[PDB]
Symmetry: D2
């Protein structure tokens, strides 16, 4: 056991995503454009979240993945052009907002019809900064959490729940 | 969700989740005390992006520590790598996670590509297996379902990049 | 047989090998003088695969100041394109020169110039070997132009048709019967 | 003039030594693939890994008196190689010539040769500009120069991504490594 405590249980998470699904599914239930809602996720923290979210949204949703390295270095771009598409960014953790800031700028330059953000977790300097997120799963404290996509050196991702890693 | 598009339902969400829980248990037993011996978690390798739905559910269903590795590919058995693995799988216990194995051509390339990286072991787990896979030559240790030779959609599987978000798997009607 | 690589495929030679290497030598001197300057970091040459590869090699050797190589790979989804291979390094605060083979519509250069400026380099200029008359419709300014050529489709010295004729030392108009 | 004044301690291979060797290699390669180009109907394929052999492949291709096509690969290390950019087309049944710049331990070539042969090309040979003593695993058909195990720069070869634009190959002044 390397988990200090369980922050968000698997039952809580699945219950919240079901709520997010309908909230999203009714902001996007009209179709008019003839094109499905596009979910864009950066590998690979929100992979667990986007697979559950897409199944929880009661409207047709399509998948788009991105792989980005650091020196803002694109290691795998979008498969198709998102021009005139309704795009929903699916993140796992928004803390400083730097990651979201870069991604949103990059996607907006591709000229989408709309662009909104859906993160599973939001830390407490993301609330002080008053970032603009359309959909927030949970408001968590500023402690390093793992599980449900989140990781520490590529581990604990397979956890059905979200717990806090013990500061050794 | 897709009115009139799905002709007949092949596999309900309930049945899919039940089989994966069974697969997870079986895989967990075979790789029991592998993290205690080697000191490294079981490595799940998945090709984007049809089996992403399946690998997320499977990883949670396996009672041993597992990690994720993704590959983005394209076609010219002839496969172009758009995004390679992030790490070196040398000496790692590797499980290939596929969505559907039909001709086995996709699998025969991936098996060869990964075995050239010299992993400690390499096995395959596919959710769906079609009858033509019997003519393939890559051994599959874990099979979710044996289905007939019909085009199915849902749970990751698609047709013109649609129906992926479906919670179940079903056949398609002339669309 | 003959010494000709593609007999009967070239309608007319637009530019010869020596004429090409002579202009590049001139461009090198011109570029070298502009970037003779003060920051410690070398001039950065950025070209997309794989038409201006032949050109950037000779150009970098023709420029009398230190030059570094950067390569990008892209693939159309017209003016919109995906990145198959990004820069290996961050060009922030770097003096960057876009090395292109042919500028016609300008759609290629327009996206690249806009993309490279979002990385915020110290300076960003464009050098193309060839320029067609349709390039005047674009809005991205070009500092160095080796040759202004007609609208006709040309090959050689990197330029291709179905991945052929790239290895030619000269540039010529492809015979119409090849692409018809 | 000198692009890097006071950085090169000595010249190993002058620009004309290199270009002269390339002409010899081009003629030699051209005659080996003389008759097996008009039979298949497809040109000779040059495959090169970025970025060290870019200068060498552009000069070599123009030195080969038969039609030659280009293919570039971008890689990274984690013998063990990560592909950043793969080949543009399928090389099944093609006549492939691997164009390298330097073969030392032979690990890089060992991976590439294995990777390309899995794509089932008709023929697969190797041409490197430079070869080091510890390259005595995978057969090399064409070698430009046999050089000592010292660290050299120029003509594609770099140190911290510099000195690639040199027309010659030489050794570096010890103060550069500071
Ligand atoms: N696992 C985990 N990762 C965390 C956490 N906080 C930030 N990160 C890093 C970052 C996500 O890191 C995932 C990158 P991967 O490990 O390569 O998939 O989230 C910061 C959001 P910000 O840019 O708006 O500040 C955390 O609590 N748990
Ligand atoms: N949606 C769907 N896709 C199918 C099916 N059969 C093969 N594929 C193609 C493929 C799975 O679908 C991948 C679609 P992509 O991710 O958009 O490229 O599996 C081929 C296995 P093989 O190489 O052994 O023949 C099917 O029944 N439904
Ligand atoms: N070989 C050849 N190619 C030409 C020509 N005109 C435009 N191109 C397309 C030229 C290269 O098109 C093929 C891409 P690659 O094979 O990777 O060089 O880029 C178009 C520039 P823009 O988007 O500003 O119009 C031509 O005359 N000959
Ligand atoms: N500058 C320089 N680089 C050298 C030298 N030897 C190997 N290299 C690196 C050479 C190429 O390394 C990649 C660097 P780059 O080609 O600049 O992207 O590896 C081949 C060695 P092996 O065949 O044993 O795998 C050398 O003497 N000088
Ligand atoms: Mg993330
Ligand atoms: Mg598959
Ligand atoms: Mg170009
Ligand atoms: Mg090399
Ligand atoms: Mg190097």
């Amino acid at each position: 056991g390397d988990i200090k405590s369980v922050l968000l249980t698997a039952e809580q998470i699945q219950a919240r995503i079901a709520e997010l699904g309908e909230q999203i599914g009714n902001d996007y239930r009209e179709a008019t454009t003839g094109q499905d809602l596009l979910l864009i996720t950066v590998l690979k923290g929100a992979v667990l979240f986007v697979t559950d979210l897409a199944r929880a949204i009661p409207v047709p949703t399509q998948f788009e993945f991105m792989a980005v390295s650091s020196y803002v270095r694109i290691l795998k771009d979008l498969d198709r052009d998102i021009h005139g598409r309704d795009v929903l960014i699916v993140e796992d953790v928004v803390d400083s907002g730097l990651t979201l800031s870069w991604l949103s700028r990059n996607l907006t330059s591709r000229n989408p019809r709309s662009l909104r953000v859906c993160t599973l977790l939001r830390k407490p300097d993301a609330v002080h900064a008053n970032v603009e997120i359309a959909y927030v799963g949970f408001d968590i404290p500023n402690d390093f959490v793992v599980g449900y996509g989140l990781d520490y050196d590529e581990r604990y991702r397979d956890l059905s729940y979200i717990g806090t890693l013990d500061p050794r």
